[PDB]
Design a protein around this ligand. Structure first.
Ligand SMILES: [Li+]
Ligand SMILES: [Li+]
Ligand SMILES: [Li+]
Ligand SMILES: [Li+]
Ligand SMILES: [Li+]
Lengths: 130, 129
């Protein structure tokens, strides 16, 4: 179920549903569904809502466990700073302006990689500045 | 409880980034990113994973807490039976043929609607067999 098309057939397969059942429910043809399940074509977001509705799950729950492969895009923020922002428990009090300030920090193409490290930088910087 | 374009706006807004920071990194134009955040147009899956990469999160995590209003499709299975199959802890060993057998059961156009009820039906039916 790691690939999206593999997950789609898994949902149908584990429920023991025939292609026509899912297709008639989703208002789409068996050949189109079959193409989606084989990965020949890529579903649109609207198609995912309908497929997820057929399986009585949310799109977010449908995409659970799905790896999208594809090309890789470098993150806008450093991973440690991004993870800190992503973590609700740690760095929640950090204002958006501070995230921008921290983002500019970088050393010689080398940056500290721990979310905890970025939190300490913020605390020390916030004490000195602001 | 949140719309997709609202979530995209929130991600950039909480990080304090500018459209151009995300856009140049994402490899998409500032106007297109603006349209995505406004809700004017819908991103493809390929574009969505690019945005997720810009925010250093998974597509699954990006869509956490996002609500889609578009669909009205009914479920292929009963809600209770579907919840049972969806739950990994409950009825993990239930075979697909058993799911199909169970799906045919309905009474007077009504069903129990509870995952626990479906599991108990399965346990007893399996025991008779
Ligand atoms: Li499917
Ligand atoms: Li068909
Ligand atoms: Li769409
Ligand atoms: Li959904
Ligand atoms: Li992803």
């Amino acid at each position: 179920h790691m690939k999206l098309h593999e997950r789609l057939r898994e949902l149908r397969s584990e429920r023991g549903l025939r292609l026509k059942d899912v297709a008639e429910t989703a208002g789409i043809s068996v050949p189109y569904l079959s193409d989606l399940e084989r990965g020949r074509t890529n579903p649109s977001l609207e198609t995912l809502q309908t497929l997820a509705g057929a399986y009585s799950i949310t799109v977010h729950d449908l995409l659970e466990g799905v790896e999208f492969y594809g090309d890789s895009t470098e993150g806008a923020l450093p991973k440690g700073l991004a993870d800190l922002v992503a973590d609700p428990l740690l760095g929640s009090q950090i204002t958006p302006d501070w995230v921008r300030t921290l983002s500019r920090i970088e050393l010689r193409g080398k940056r500290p990689r721990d979310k905890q490290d970025w939190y300490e930088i913020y605390l020390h910087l916030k004490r000195i500045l602001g």
